[PDB]
Design a protein around this ligand. Sequence first.
Ligand code: NA
Ligand code: NA
Lengths: 313, 310
Amino acid sequence: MKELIRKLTEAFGPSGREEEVRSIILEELEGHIDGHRIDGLGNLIVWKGSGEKKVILDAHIAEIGVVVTNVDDKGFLTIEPVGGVSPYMLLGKRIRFENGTIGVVGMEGETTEERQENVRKLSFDKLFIDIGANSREEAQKMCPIGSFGVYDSGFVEVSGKYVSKAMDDRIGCAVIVEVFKRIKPAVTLYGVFSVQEEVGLVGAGYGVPADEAIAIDVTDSADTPKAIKRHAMRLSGGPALKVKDRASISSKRILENLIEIAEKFDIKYQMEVLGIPSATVSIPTRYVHSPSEMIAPDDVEATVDLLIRYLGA
Amino acid sequence: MKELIRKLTEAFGPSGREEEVRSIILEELEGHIDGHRIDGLGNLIVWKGSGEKKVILDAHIAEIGVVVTNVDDKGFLTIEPVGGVSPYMLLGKRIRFENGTIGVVGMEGETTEERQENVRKLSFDKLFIDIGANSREEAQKMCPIGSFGVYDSGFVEVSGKYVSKAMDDRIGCAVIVEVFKRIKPAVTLYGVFSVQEEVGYGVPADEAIAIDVTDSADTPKAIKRHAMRLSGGPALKVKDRASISSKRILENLIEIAEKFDIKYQMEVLTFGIPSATVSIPTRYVHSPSEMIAPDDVEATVDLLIRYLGA
Ligand code: NA
Ligand code: NA
């Protein structure tokens, strides 16, 4: 599963430009699905099995990133965030653009005073990206306005932990793919690798009737220094099963099912305390929205096992 | 080209299941190409020639259709569209599935009033497909959930016009095949029979020309000016956002048409590697009876052969 996670997390797929991720998902699923299609909205749907009960597993396919909004006379780029990228995570960082261009993020300010006031209240309008261009014309040919970029950071093993960009939510995508690769389904199983509308716009179950929908997401792992929170999710604590405050009767039934499956098959799990009946299963992740998101492989394996025990014959 | 168009339009090839279309294309191209490959997504790429300039001709091989999304206790199928199938185009129509299973599309509504209400705002949730099964078990053996169906229509010649399903875009596929059959290329010529919409081609070409279909707006009450029409020739697509290089391809094609005396028409604006689009005027797009004029297809083949040939 390590190579699968490496490929999916390293793939280029900021919001709206996720074609490479869909391609990797389809190639990885070759010989393991009965069919696939893309719906009008861009969601990738795959399926396997013929059981009477129909179940959707849903993971988001986009990653956070940036988009070029301006090019100045000296070839420097202005950017804005796509998703939850903090400007503080971009300082001195490298960005990989869709066409392969690498850029360096710098901050405006010459004097120590100016730079210090700028970092104290850092905003995107104080950042720029250097792609090595010496003119607007050079930069426009290399990285036109509207170009998307992602963290130029890849997969690395950190003493048994896995670290990469875009664990949120490529690790969920990886869980679903791996379940499809292994499972002999007792259900009709759907995998949905879903898009998300920009905040401010109309938003999207999908184009498939089903009895249950399980979202495979990430959740913050609050097990780092000085974390002083009850209800804390931790690495190696297992899949996090979400206790939703306003959940329907049918949704609570799914949650209880998963608890029983986990307990009966000796699968580690933890309870996360904040239409198709739904449940959420999450991978505990450190440093969400950084270029170095971190998971514990045993949590991911436990999540795959939980789903296979629940849905497999 | 008649038999080539018959075979390609009648072939079974909804999105994701185009094996028969690829087989026909390679059978028609045997002895006319230098090589081919099918990539991991299912794109079929062929090539011929060794000129320094590399040119791609692209057409997509999927046709519109339906996908089975449920089966009820009595064997009736629930369906969703794949591509631009209107529910009004399915009423009382036959659908063919991959193993040759034929189904009939029905609409819910017992009384005349219920049916009158349902056709006023027809939606897929009021449609079903009857494949002759008498139970879920019988239906699931023939046509499991996730099965794709296409129109159960075929090719017929109508007073010199060609009518079939899937002119969009099997007619573009046919154009590319016919070019490879006839051309002695001055370029290295690539033909890409694409499935790229499956992910929303490993050839570093200099130009790409998409061969597509465009609506022929020459039917009754069509009052749009500069409308595309049957027998007006290949429709050359005007692009507003186009690069200088993309505009150059379009200007090149206009010059070829005029210098070789090939009929052509300009598809006006409505408000990657350099590319242009050349389209076949087609009536009744997305119906089971898409209609082209063979002289437009021939003119399109000629345009590409004269642009790209030695
Ligand atoms: Na061949
Ligand atoms: Na079609």
